[PDB]
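Loading example: each entry is read as three labelled lines plus one structure line.
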Amino acid sequence: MKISDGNWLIQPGLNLIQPVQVYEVEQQGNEMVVYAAPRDVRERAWQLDTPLFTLRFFSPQEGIIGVRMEHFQGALDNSPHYPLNVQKDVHVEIENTAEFAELKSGSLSVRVTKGEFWALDFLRDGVRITGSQLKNNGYVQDSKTQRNYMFERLDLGVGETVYGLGERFTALVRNGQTVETWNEDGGTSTEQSYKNIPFYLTNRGYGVLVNHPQRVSFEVGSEKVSKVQFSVEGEYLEYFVIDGPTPKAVLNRYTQFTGRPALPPAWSFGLWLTTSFTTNYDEATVNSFIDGMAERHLPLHVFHFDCFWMKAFQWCDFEWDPLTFPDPEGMIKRLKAKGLKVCVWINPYIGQRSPVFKELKEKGYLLKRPDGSLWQWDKWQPGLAIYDFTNPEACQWYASKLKGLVAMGVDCFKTDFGERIPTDVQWFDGSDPQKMHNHYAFIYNELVWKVLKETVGEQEAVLFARSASVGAQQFPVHWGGDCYANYESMAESLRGGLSIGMSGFGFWSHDIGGFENTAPAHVYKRWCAFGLLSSHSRLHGSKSYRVPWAYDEESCDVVRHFTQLKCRMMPYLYRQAALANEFGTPMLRAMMLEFPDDPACDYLDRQYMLGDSVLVAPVFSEAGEVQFYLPEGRWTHLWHNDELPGSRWHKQRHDALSLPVYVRDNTLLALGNNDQKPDYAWHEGTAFQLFQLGDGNETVCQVPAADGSAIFTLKAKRQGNTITVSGEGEARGWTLCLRNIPQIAGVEGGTQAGSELGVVVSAQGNALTIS
Amino acid sequence: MKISDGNWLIQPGLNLIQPVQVYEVEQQGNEMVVYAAPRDVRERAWQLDTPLFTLRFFSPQEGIIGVRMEHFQGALDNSPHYPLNVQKDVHVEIENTAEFAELKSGSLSVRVTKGEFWALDFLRDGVRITGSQLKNNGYVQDSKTQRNYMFERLDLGVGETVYGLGERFTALVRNGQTVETWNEDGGTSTEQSYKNIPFYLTNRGYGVLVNHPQRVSFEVGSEKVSKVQFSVEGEYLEYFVIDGPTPKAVLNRYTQFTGRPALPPAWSFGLWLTTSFTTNYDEATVNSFIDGMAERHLPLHVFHFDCFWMKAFQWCDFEWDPLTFPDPEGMIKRLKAKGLKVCVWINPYIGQRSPVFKELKEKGYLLKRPDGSLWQWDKWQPGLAIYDFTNPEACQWYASKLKGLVAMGVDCFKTDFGERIPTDVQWFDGSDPQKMHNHYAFIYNELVWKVLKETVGEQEAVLFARSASVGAQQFPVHWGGDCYANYESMAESLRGGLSIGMSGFGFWSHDIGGFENTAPAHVYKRWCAFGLLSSHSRLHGSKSYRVPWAYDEESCDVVRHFTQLKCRMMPYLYRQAALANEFGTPMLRAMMLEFPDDPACDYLDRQYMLGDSVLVAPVFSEAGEVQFYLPEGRWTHLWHNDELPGSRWHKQRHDALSLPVYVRDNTLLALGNNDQKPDYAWHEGTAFQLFQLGDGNETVCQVPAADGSAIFTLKAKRQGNTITVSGEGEARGWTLCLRNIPQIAGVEGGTQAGSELGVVVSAQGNALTIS
Amino acid sequence: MKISDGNWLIQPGLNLIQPVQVYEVEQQGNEMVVYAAPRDVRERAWQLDTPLFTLRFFSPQEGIIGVRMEHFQGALDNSPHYPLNVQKDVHVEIENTAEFAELKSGSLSVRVTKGEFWALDFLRDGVRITGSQLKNNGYVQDSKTQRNYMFERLDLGVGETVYGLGERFTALVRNGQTVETWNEDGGTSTEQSYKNIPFYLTNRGYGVLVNHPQRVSFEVGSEKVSKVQFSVEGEYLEYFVIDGPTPKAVLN
């Protein structure tokens, strides 16, 4: 795969053909075409017996520029293709003068210089941000394998940092990594990633996407350190560049282009418990677990059944084991009557040991080897087979089975696996195996989501997936995978979650307490604290039950405290989720995203930002010592009320019941009066919290509704020593707690009282003034 | 080379044999031997038909532990070997109890746990810092190539950062990089490095070295992200671990183990000018350049002749071209009478087009192909041949030629190239080609240094090398190589210099203004400012003369100002160089090395620390805007006298004549009264500078002598509002300038006066008190 | 074609997967199905990521027991097939207790022992005459040719003599002969035979037939002298055992 053997020579047996000069430029409607040659062609003698690269520049969307470089147009382009939304009503400008060619869309433009010097530049309002230099857009012919490759290099300035490229557990900064996009089930410790999506982002406000479902070779910080290289097999290379003043705008544009993330239901934002994988469980075990959880005053909202709810060596057969669950319907009804939810595990792989295998083979719904046979291997299940989702009949059968299961009483499904797809197979539709290897997960997720929305509805639709591809954000619920019970594993999982958040996914989850091995105790408490502060919290294990009382009472106490805190913080999290659905900004934001202009947060990965106001720095030390950096502004702890100056580092030691969680200044948070359920009336009896309202500043807060649309808005304006608060919308009774304010010297229409956290004013109207 | 295909399976055709249990432990004098097996062997039935790994633990030096893992002892171990200093009078302790085996040396110890659980740990006073877990010390047999490999993995905690691994121009942090140690001439942009040395350091205070001159495969942050992997071909793996509270102690121990860096002469610390590479130059051109430099009041100390001082297609023949330099002796004498120095370019490669080639072939002093022939290829010179330094007669001939050249009037030599050594050759001594590929540069440098010390002397010995290996620090003068005229190239060169400094080399240099292409202007000024603040400053070009007046007068003015500043700062730089020679601490320290306890400096590479007190942040922007981070303490500019609070970031815009250079608080710097030569009496008429002497603190300063030993020491103690300064040694007249002090309210024995930078007190004695 | 390079090691590049334990037993009408695994699967941890051999025992005719061992059912089975007369009105008995599984037809029976010890026995009125021991019913994957083979070994007592295997001009007793079934016109002096039919008989009154028109590799008295080995390329192995007090009844 190596192209350059240093800086002066290249590897043997690699013919390189690169553009050196611009020959012709044409305007086809709203697109620009450039025909270039590798040598001087100004003279008539050399206008023959040479290749000719064709570069097409277009603008599928405002602020996005697509470039397609081609050598031979006689090759075949088979299905599938990435689901990209393209608009044909975009205003674009083209300037073709004797000196250069410019294609301008929105605030972005692409410039190509004619003459002896070949150069490509991308300009954001007339200033270069990146581009391609001379002899950096070559085409490679390999005689050893008789193969062809197309590679492209993009320049990098000083201080550039690359982020994204899917779920990677390596260092957050991708500089120096030879990442490759190929879905593989190799755990979390290894560089292999369950979900791969070719797209990267830079701190300067520009992002790059590659439209190639097949394998793509990436080199960031590798050979040609000052440039980022991406290469692909074939004859044509297509890639898109998205501009934006800040990374948030780039993410918004990307989410608009590839699909907006959906809004998970409110009840999904809660604690989830599973029956582990290898443990022996039955109806009595589930009942005892639920009774014990209820007795210890530990709220529970979601319950999950793992793979062994079916028969051994039978997965997936969609039939309950008679010896373990004689009456699934009665158990599901009893659980639902108790206020819980039921949701199960499925996978797109079937086992040979199953009565329905013969019928499925007869109906021809399974994947077929090229000549006449089926594809099987010694893996997760004996005689493994893969459903052929390209055949509509198989999809209909799967949908009917899922509909029956949903009618039984199920709510969501856990789409595990879906990445170890072979390539030496013949699909029913005749699609290219290389691209199907990555598109299979998207197809499966789309089918499951369609079934779920047809049965229950869009609002209650939710899933739990481990594999993903481009466009999967439309069904956003993801799980890191298999992790170990160590601090390093927690750090790697946090890094992967941040990376996937920065890659366009707005929701992420991880296994609390680890999957493999048994956690001693302290690491379990820290993992519980970290996970319960995220979008979703899951309790899943491999060999041991992940129940707090199995270790000690302190774990139960901390779990109860953190769950109560999360329930009390539901409205803010739901508002952040609605913002993520609208503008595409992930809820689990990284430090850089909130403050891209601060160089100190470029290389921060041990702490994260929740919402647009909360900062969390989970501990990773036995003694509890932890160091975290605060940007400019005064920060106040969520429940400790201490103040710390910003724009500097800080070191602190905390016990198992506390960890560094802070809120920026000039903030108006919202909380509810219910700490047991996440689906309560957020606009009834709400408590707003005022943090460090500086003079001359204004703050706003919008409590969302069930559908996510704001139902009531409150605005606070401070002038001198008087603060006026005005609210409009729908509400009945609320309180405002000014923090770090022992007392006030006057109120207008509000009943004031003191509290350990400040001054609480209950409002009998929709307008108050406090001096 | 890949071993694990994820986390559950491995690549086909790779047999893995790993230790799982400890069978026996023995004590041989001061060494420990552990015999281990891959399976349970407690029972007599399984005590046969299985392999057995042998692990030898020893302590070649205090604070260093060497581990040797072996499978077969019947293999051949041929020359050469790394020049490691081993002491046989080291006190060590061994504890062999029924539970574990402990080998303790100094403050470090190695612990191995017996029983069913195999584990290896390294303890610094009883607390683990790293080690090897189960099934991470395997041995790999590859049937495809019928090869054998030995790999070892070392654990990494949270926040670990890896540095070193030689001259690398990639990101400073090695996390996520699959570095490989193999000398190659592939420029600076590519990941290939001219000089490679297997050794890495961690921020926690422990470093690792691999004793294998042959190719070593390194994986940091790659597969098995939470571990660092190193693998080597063969049957035995040897590696050393060095402890230390801080990285500086680790560097000191490493320099003591492998060789202390030498002390370059004082005159070497000056401006160097060359006649470029491809430019046409002769005696008249050199005379005109020198006259122009003298006219513009630009001091010059060293002059260099590039490759073309010989005849074309003749290198290396060691004969002056008659058509260009008819009388080299007269020119050298004239240059020496003018106060300059003469020093030339050499390489270990000879060209076929040369009268002496036939004689050399007849004498058999050249490298030979295995059967009967010579080794040649189409490269730098036609019919290239490599001197066989393993033959003493060839070394004697080379030494005689170098002695003649030195007698002609030369001072140093520029040992270029020495990395593109083949492997399919038969050496005279019969050494292994794989190890000679890396040891050839060391052998050549050692021969040249021996000749130089025999002719001139140790004090005046100096060189200019591009290739290096383990133990080359004993002749420390290095040059980055070929760079481009861009800000990115400057950043990459700075990163490489910092990396090589952290790898055990105490001196480094780079080409100012770039090697390839012509710099516009501003970048040239910034590069001049950056280089003139380093240990050595060189003006070398490829196609254009690197003379300031060739661009504009502003470049000349800034060059003059910076050269005067460097000359005025000579004593402090020489003291830092003496410290580097003694304790091994490089002069061009990175931010982390000075403040390892500050997490904010972990990922800093655009700014560096000169000495133990100076901080420089060269600019990389056209507009002059630059952002830099200051650790705790008050910092004052070298010549602007402004104060800035520490422990935070700062942004500033500077013109071409200024850049961010600052000095920490509680500092007593020293400067000289001569700004034209670097070889003046530093202890005569010296000016000490006092920066922010806090109450209750004490500061010391030692001005060095020609040999580097301190000649005079000054100590200042502040109590309340009275500062007492006491000096002892050899000096005649000096001044002390307290900065940011407009006036004083009393002096004792010193004549006080005011100045724009503070208060200057001339001392007529060796003890003063100021209230 | 060689599988075992002696008695302790095997030839390089030959992956062997053999049944070691009985996992499940099922009764499908007049047939018995046994699902077995190469490792202990009593615990839930090892009930995955492992193969599973399927053994089907049936009785096409009174006094005859047919055994079909399979690994992958996705392979193609094209025409032709041997013209075997099969009766669907045969009285058979099945006994599935917690200790062993027995399929009895006429005077013959097949017994499989459950638990940690895997063993297959053929009983003529309750007395063993032959069977398969542990680690003798393996499946071979050859990476060199990327091929797959299924081999089966049957025990031999003292004094056993093998006869038949078609028109062979070698010694009447087949002990010590590596016969192969492949029609070839190589005269009469050479071991090659014009007519080949995979079937052998023993003096003790039991005979064995292999239902595989394709090439079948036979080893009688060769490596594993105390056993008779037959191997075939593919993924499924089917063979029938016929009882009888005397060889004449077996021939009938």
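The radius of gyration of chain B is 28 Å.
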